[PDB]
Every structure is written in structure tokens, then in C-alpha cells.
Amino acid sequence: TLTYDDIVGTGLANKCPTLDDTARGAYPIDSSQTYRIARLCLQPTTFLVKEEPKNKRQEAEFVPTKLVTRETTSLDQIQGELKVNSDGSLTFVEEDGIDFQPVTVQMAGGERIPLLFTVKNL
């Protein structure tokens, strides 16, 4: 386990925790208990933007972009209730956290695309 001084300036602060390859197990859900997500983290690796179609009205594709706003992109420290439904399904209801980041990516040719990368009210 790492401290702030271990992490500061390395770029690790913008990465989500990972689990090892051995973690292919199963987490029992007891429909009688209440559950919560204590920490949700989302770490983007790729931003794709849909090209504004020439006018062929054919398939407009999502194309690669270059991140220009650095390691400032991740959503983290997100919490909320994890409901167990009648049908045995789970529903995560986001309540609070660092659940948005402004992000600017750049398309080939220079066009900059700002977006509010978010999961607000997920």
C-alpha cells in the first residue's frame, strides 16, 4: 500500500485500483441484506469522437483522438446504494463523488473537442 508521497507526480493518482489475475471468483449476494458501492472508479483509456458525416448519410465512424488535458480524466471516490431487485438484478444508484471531469481531446487536423466526461446521477 502506497502513501501520497509515493504517488505524487507519477500519474498513478489518475489510475483506478486493479485486481490480480487470480481474482476470477464470485461475490455472494444475500437478498435480505442492504448493499452499497463504497468506491467506484472509472479510468478512461480511449476517447473516440463521431466524425460529422460528409453528406453521404452513410456510416459515420468513431475516430481516435489525442488527449491534450493530461492525466486529469478519471472519475473516482463515487459511492451509492446497490439495490437488490425482485428479479434478482442489482441496481446501482449513484449518490455522490468526483463524478465528472472536463476533458479536451483533439481530432486529426486540430479540431478540439471539449466534453464533460461524467456519470452524474448514474
Binding site: 460528409k54 453528406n55 453521404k56 486529426a108 487536423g109
Partner: protein
């Protein structure tokens, strides 16, 4: 003196200055190629190779 249309004849028996004049001409042409490419890049729209290619 020399008429205006003969000024460059001073180079005929001066190989070093002829090389200089040729160097200058070469500099101008290469400078044109560079400038022309820049102007084209500043005006070229790469967004539609189908109906808006370079030759349009």
C-alpha cells in the same frame, strides 16, 4: 554601360559569381516550394477525399 537586358552577362567570365547566382536562384525556387506548401496547408480542407479532394 550595359543595357538593362544584359546586366547578368557580368557572370559569363566569373565562375564563382555564376555559382552564387545559381545558388540564389536555387534558394528562391526552394523557398517558393516551401512557401507554396505552407499556403496550401493553411487553406486545404482534408475532411472529404471523396467530394472535396485536393484537385477541387
Amino acid at each position: 554601360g550595359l543595357p538593362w537586358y544584359r546586366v547578368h552577362t557580368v557572370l559569363i567570365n566569373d565562375p564563382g559569381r555564376l555559382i552564387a547566382a545559381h545558388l540564389m536562384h536555387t534558394a528562391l525556387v526552394a523557398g517558393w516550394a516551401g512557401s507554396m506548401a505552407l499556403y496550401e496547408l493553411a487553406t486545404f480542407d482534408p475532411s472529404d477525399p471523396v467530394l472535396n479532394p485536393m484537385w477541387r
